[PDB]
Amino acid sequence: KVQTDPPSVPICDLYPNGVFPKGQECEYPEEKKALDQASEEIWNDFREAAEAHRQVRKYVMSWIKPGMTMIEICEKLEDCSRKLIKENGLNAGLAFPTGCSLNNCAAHYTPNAGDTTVLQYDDICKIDFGTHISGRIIDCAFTVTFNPKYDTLLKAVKDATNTGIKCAGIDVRLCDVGEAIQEVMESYEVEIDGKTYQVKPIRNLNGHSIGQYRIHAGKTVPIIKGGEATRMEEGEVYAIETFGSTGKGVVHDDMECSHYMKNFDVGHVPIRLPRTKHLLNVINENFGTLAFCRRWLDRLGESKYLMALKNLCDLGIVDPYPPLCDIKGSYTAQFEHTILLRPTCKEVVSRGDDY
Ligand SMILES: CO[C@@H](C(=O)N[C@H]1CC[C@@H](O)CNC1=O)[C@H](O)[C@@H](O)[C@H](O)/C=C/C(C)(C)C
């Protein structure tokens, strides 16, 4: 069987023998082959999630248009993602909420219930969403625009992200990747509405290592120089993402929060407060240590849960991730891919024919 025009066939049903397509395999900048084959089932899970990501985003690009509300966009994307990944509790599903951050806002924004925001012709929207199979997460993102005036800014960030991807590798120092990304990013100048700007990396936003059910495993991939000389290791998985801005090149928390995620290091915590106890149970059952958003709690039939959620945040059990924005009037863009540092090569597992 093949995929229907508007995708609806699970990726696992498109692949009979349970063997999924590899991403772009690259040479780094025998026994290791045996070691690589030993984790084949893991690489395969990443590939299944990546193929779902590729097919979902291809679909999104065909219909996303100004006039649609941000809620309509996210619900349409998420519905497709759930169907192609063949959602099954914590064994297969959405790794995190659909980011659709607009203009000066660079990341971590998704609408909460009631949000009336409508996508505009001049908007620059960062679609950042994730999929996973058995906790093997694909963190991948692109930027959507309708006005050609942002073309060079988008190209700047694409080139910067690919440079970071090419520089990445086993034994490579993280600070070197950041320095490389920055020199490419800043080599671009753009003109938007009569004003010129030297593209600037958003210095306090970074790429990161990825772990099972842990989007932010512990290591950071900076996008500017001056970072840590810590090195990348064999077997690690990384999200290489870069952000370019026409503003200050720095983001701050802004707007209402929609994203939340349980602190991975916090262990079991007995709670007697009834509503707070119930919410934590709902989170443990449906998300575990994966991120979620308010719309996802509404979907599960939960209501009047905001105070319970605040309690979990105040207790440090859950962490809030508010939208991150540059100054008013600035424009930000993002591109991101997930890479596997396999023993025999580097695989840009989420690479597509689109980006
Ligand atoms: C700027 O957004 C990325 C991010 O924060 N990176 C982190 C990386 C780990 C530490 O260095 C803290 N600083 C960061 O910028 C995210 O990983 C997103 O790419 C991802 O899609 C969203 C994840 C959440 C946790 C909000 C669901």
Ligand SMILES: [Co+2]
């Ligand atoms: Co992302």
Ligand SMILES: [Co+2]
């Ligand atoms: Co990321």
